[PDB]
Amino acid sequence: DYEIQRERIELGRCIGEGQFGDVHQGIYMSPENPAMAVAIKTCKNCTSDSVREKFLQEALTMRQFDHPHIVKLIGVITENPVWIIMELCTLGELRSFLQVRKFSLDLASLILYAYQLSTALAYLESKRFVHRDIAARNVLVSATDCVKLGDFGLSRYMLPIKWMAPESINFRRFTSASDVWMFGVCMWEILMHGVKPFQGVKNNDVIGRIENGERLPMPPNCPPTLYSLMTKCWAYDPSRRPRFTELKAQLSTILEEEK
Ligand SMILES: CNC(=O)c1ccccc1Nc1ncnc(Nc2cc(OC)c(OC)c(OC)c2)n1
Incomplete structure (x- = not known):
């Protein structure tokens, strides 16, 4: 399950942007664990199912790869506003x-x-x-x-x-x-x-x-x-x-x- 609870994510400063919106650095928090630094792709005007589908396809692209020298997918938040959470x-x-x-x-x-x-x-x-x-x-x-x-x-x-x-x-x-x-x-x-x-x-x-x-x-x-x-x-x-x-x-x- 790649779905992440929004309250586990703390949004930090923007570190750039892509086609769909701003990218942020931040933290992924989970009980008993150290705070994990993450990059967060956002979507200005997700929801609209075409745009949301295109944006989320990028997460699906990264999902299929598991390599030490390729950034990893951590998870997604599929409710508005839609975020993709990556390894920072x-x-x-x-x-x-x-x-x-x-x-x-x-x-x-x-x-x-x-x-x-x-x-x-x-x-x-x-x-x-x-x-x-x-x-x-x-x-x-x-x-x-x-x-x-x-x-x-x-x-x-x-x-x-x-x-x-x-x-x-x-x-x-x-x-x-x-x-x-x-x-x-x-x-x-x-x-x-x-x-x-x-x-x-x-x-x-x-x-x-x-x-x-x-x-x-x-x-x-x-x-x-x-x-x-x-x-x-x-x-x-x-x-x-x-x-x-x-x-x-x-x-x-x-x-x-x-x-
Ligand atoms: C190929 N470019 C990307 O994946 C990318 C582009 C813009 C912003 C974030 C990107 N992705 C990404 N993925 C994982 N880690 C990072 N780290 C990162 C990327 C940065 O700039 C691209 C940073 O400087 C603004 C930075 O400083 C804290 C961290 N970025």
Whole structure:
């Protein structure tokens, strides 16, 4: 039973927003237990059964996954106003975190984040789930040594041209291999401490550059084998890209090498 009593939830400050309404941090309380920190998605004008159904489908999406590096569904409140209660990552967005902690994070930590995310994405691959929104903006920080894929509903779109595989841009095709492309971009962002890809470049010129063979450059202090793995994710032909299963394996070795 995923239904939660409203009085068990204490609403705190807003930590952002999505399509349906504001997102809040807060507390989930239960007798005999410590107060559990939670994120709370709200719906301005739920009830209206179409809108309420769409909003709640996002909870159902998260329900089917059980992984250490993907935010977990805690529960729902199906009465008005309708809330979805999620596991809180207390340190926020990965981009901000990397930008501020730049002189306090070593290379091992950054590779650790890439590795952790790859395990989440290999997990999704095995369930045949296509994310479509893999970007550093959608990764959350649970602890200095732990990151997680954020809510899938809240991850939705920015078309994220600068993150997208050519076949996704050209033919609206979205597969695990297009996800791999995006993950390659996400690793580059991590190594760059949260600098955005194709800075200063118009979206329309981006496809022209990829088609001309241009790729994002090797980040300073990124190890060669890791940049080599990144460029494989950016193979123009999707069938030449490694699967997340292979990425996990190779990121494991690269990480160990670095430690
Ligand atoms: C992919 N983005 C999300 O899932 C998301 C976006 C906006 C707000 C909350 C989101 N989801 C979420 N899920 C679990 N934990 C968190 N934690 C979190 C997220 C934050 O910013 C996105 C925070 O800074 C404002 C923050 O500081 C306390 C915590 N967010």
